[PDB]
Symmetry: D2
Subunit: 133 residues, 4 copies
């Protein structure tokens, strides 16, 4: 992502977060996903009165990109942001989807609303991940 800095991707993730639908938790999360050809996809959490139907920002971004014709392995990086003490931690469900759609080498930029950043990978977030060949 020669033309996409971590700062720019975090800024897009914060912009994504503003569109969240989270009236149940009141906990807004944003994600921004940048593809192999430099296209950026926003994701936010989208809640439901039946909590089990809630969808996370990371997954919203990835599903949106897939719907646009991007395929597993076509993503350069994803940034995720929430109002947390440290850089936001993706949930396990998001990690499983990130590893399948982004591959273990997907760069994951985690941040909060206070300038705290850590850079990791989908593989590092989910060691010895489950696969079905």
């Amino acid at each position: 992502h020669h033309h996409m800095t971590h700062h720019a991707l975090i800024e897009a993730a914060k912009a994504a977060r503003e569109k969240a639908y989270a009236p149940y938790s009141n906990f807004k999360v944003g994600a921004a996903l940048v593809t192999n050809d430099g296209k950026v996809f926003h994701g936010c959490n989208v809640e439901n009165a039946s909590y089990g139907l809630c969808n996370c920002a990371e997954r919203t971004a990835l599903f949106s990109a897939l719907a646009a014709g991007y395929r597993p392995g076509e993503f350069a990086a994803i940034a995720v942001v929430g109002e947390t003490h440290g850089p936001i931690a993706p949930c396990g469900a998001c990690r499983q989807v990130m590893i399948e759609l982004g591959k273990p080498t997907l760069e994951v930029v985690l941040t909060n609303m206070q300038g705290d950043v850590r850079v990791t990978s989908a593989g590092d977030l989910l060691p010895d991940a489950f696969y079905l060949a």
Copy 2:
């Protein structure tokens, strides 16, 4: 926008599906009240419970773009089913909250069979 145009959009959406486990591609096309179209496709996962449906993919995308619950006109859904495709209960629960009971739902298949219903009709006495 015609129902035919929306169905065609859903068919186009379907082509972009990721369904290596079921080998069963589904498409959806959601139109907003102001005329914007959002494509949705099913996106599967090795952990089956993490699979996402076309209808939900389209709705989540529209929310991510800044649309709010109740700002949608209709959704078309298509797969290679015998009759018009039947949305699963999970999709129905999401459609009713984000689309409202009055959301028009256009169900179809790859053979031209069509049924029109609403989010409310699909999920009687909803949560």
Copy 3:
């Protein structure tokens, strides 16, 4: 087994719920055709999409014990709702597959309001 007894079992099940996020406890009691009762409660998670409902907890438990789809007589569901509690679309999708459309569903609240329905009625033209 009486409907009253099944409802009381669902109330007992409800007490064991893990719902610190919604603070809203739900119970279910599933009775098999040979008369065994399985309790279910909702079990929430910090990642909301991973929350499991009472209805599903009871059905999954019965499957894990060795019961097969279609081997169930009825399920009761209870929460502190205004009228009888309404099962979500996700539960309806699971109930129709594991219980079959003819599965009797007894919906109730903490005030004595009851409605009896079926898995098929709750999910018209199911997937």
Copy 4:
């Protein structure tokens, strides 16, 4: 779990696996959970024609124990088994539920149908896990 060996817990997980409802994947998984007072709960995967409603063995076992009145932190160990090359890897969704219900220190015994075993913890499976305080 003084009276429950890893071997005994694995044997219970294999017995659990036999009861799986997996006509879609044809991939049966079993789990066995042992509580603080030595009670054992079986779990198996339970599939649905709409794949997003499938439930995993690990989660089936934990939800069953919760329904019996066991609470977060009341679990000593969980064994998980499937027909895999190495010890079966729990999916990310299961890891998120295991960490909340079992706590980071929950002992996780992973195995297959060919005698391969590894012992880990819920925390090790899900580093820097997501929580809501």
